[PDB]
Scaffold this motif. Structure first.
Motif, PDB file in Angstrom:
ATOM      1  N   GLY A   1       0.844  -1.000  -0.123  1.00  0.00           N
ATOM      2  CA  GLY A   1       0.139   0.098  -0.004  1.00  0.00           C
ATOM      3  C   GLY A   1       0.912   1.433  -0.398  1.00  0.00           C
TER       4      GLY A   1
ATOM      5  N   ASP B   1       4.642   1.989  -0.610  1.00  0.00           N
ATOM      6  CA  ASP B   1       5.283   2.620  -1.933  1.00  0.00           C
ATOM      7  C   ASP B   1       6.479   3.864  -0.710  1.00  0.00           C
ATOM      8  OD1 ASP B   1       3.844   1.563  -3.175  1.00  0.00           O
ATOM      9  OD2 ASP B   1       2.138   3.506  -3.393  1.00  0.00           O
TER      10      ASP B   1
ATOM     11  N   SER C   1       3.547  -3.276  -8.018  1.00  0.00           N
ATOM     12  CA  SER C   1       2.150  -2.739  -7.477  1.00  0.00           C
ATOM     13  C   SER C   1       2.217  -2.055  -6.793  1.00  0.00           C
ATOM     14  CB  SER C   1       2.492  -3.998  -6.857  1.00  0.00           C
ATOM     15  OG  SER C   1       2.474  -4.903  -7.378  1.00  0.00           O
TER      16      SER C   1
ATOM     17  N   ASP D   1       0.254   1.449  -5.074  1.00  0.00           N
ATOM     18  CA  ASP D   1      -1.048   1.661  -4.868  1.00  0.00           C
ATOM     19  C   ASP D   1      -1.377   3.193  -5.297  1.00  0.00           C
ATOM     20  OD1 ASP D   1      -3.362   2.223  -3.097  1.00  0.00           O
ATOM     21  OD2 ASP D   1      -3.214   1.519  -1.291  1.00  0.00           O
TER      22      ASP D   1
ATOM     23  N   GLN E   1      -4.004   4.093  -6.103  1.00  0.00           N
ATOM     24  CA  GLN E   1      -5.157   4.855  -5.555  1.00  0.00           C
ATOM     25  C   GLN E   1      -5.417   5.916  -4.748  1.00  0.00           C
ATOM     26  OE1 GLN E   1      -8.744   3.156  -3.486  1.00  0.00           O
ATOM     27  NE2 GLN E   1      -9.410   3.394  -5.683  1.00  0.00           N
ATOM     28  N   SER E   2      -4.618   5.676  -3.748  1.00  0.00           N
ATOM     29  CA  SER E   2      -3.754   5.807  -2.267  1.00  0.00           C
ATOM     30  C   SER E   2      -3.207   7.073  -2.373  1.00  0.00           C
ATOM     31  CB  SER E   2      -2.965   5.233  -1.221  1.00  0.00           C
ATOM     32  OG  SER E   2      -4.042   3.948  -0.529  1.00  0.00           O
TER      33      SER E   2
END
Ligand code: HEM
Ligand SMILES: Cc1cc(Br)ccc1O
Length: 137
Positions: free
Chosen positions: A1, A5, A114, A116, A118-119
């Protein structure tokens, strides 16, 4: 998440700082209005320029601190007021920040990693809101 990141980005911070900023300047070339000494340069030429690498890394150093101090992608009011009150940001509006975060999110969505995305989109949104509340037009 999001917290992982922040770790990923910090593990290759000068590459990610430079590549994300170039993604921003290439997607929104009129933003060079704020960066007149980077006009008429390719990506590789900018990466050789002392001010470019040091500016981008110091920007990205602070962005990651602001991200890391956030809760659920909402930055601290102390961090937003720093960004609003900085003499360096005298001429800026929230639109400048939105565009940077669109560029960052599209960079993450084009990576095979991978992230995140959207975050980060949420973080950019929330930061724009915090900057408005702290006095940015
Ligand atoms: C979260 C987002 C941002 C953070 C954490 C941040 C942080 C910083 C920091 C630390 C500096 C000082 C850099 C140095 O002197 O080496 C700086 C300078 C500056 N920032 Fe920001 N910044 C942000 C977003 C933006 C945006 C969106 C713009 C314009 C589109 C912008 C324009 C500038 C300008 C023009 C300077 C000084 C001249 C130069 O860029 O070399 N910043 N910022
Ligand atoms: C707006 C901006 C973003 C990054 Br990432 C690096 C430098 C800079 O000025």
């Amino acid at each position: 998440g999001f917290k992982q990141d922040i770790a990923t980005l910090r593990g290759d911070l000068r590459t990610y700082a430079q590549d994300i900023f170039l993604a921003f300047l290439n997607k929104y070339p009129d933003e060079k209005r704020n960066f007149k000494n980077y006009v008429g340069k390719s990506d590789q030429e900018l990466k050789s320029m002392a001010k470019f690498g040091d500016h981008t890394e110091k920007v990205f150093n602070l962005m990651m601190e602001v991200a890391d101090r956030a809760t659920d992608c909402v930055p601290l009011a102390s961090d937003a007021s720093t960004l609003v009150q900085m003499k360096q940001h005298s001429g800026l509006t929230t639109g400048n920040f939105e565009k940077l975060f669109v560029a960052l999110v599209e960079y993450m969505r084009a990576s095979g990693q991978s992230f995140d995305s959207q975050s980060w989109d949420r973080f950019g949104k929330n930061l724009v809101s915090a900057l408005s509340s702290a006095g940015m037009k």
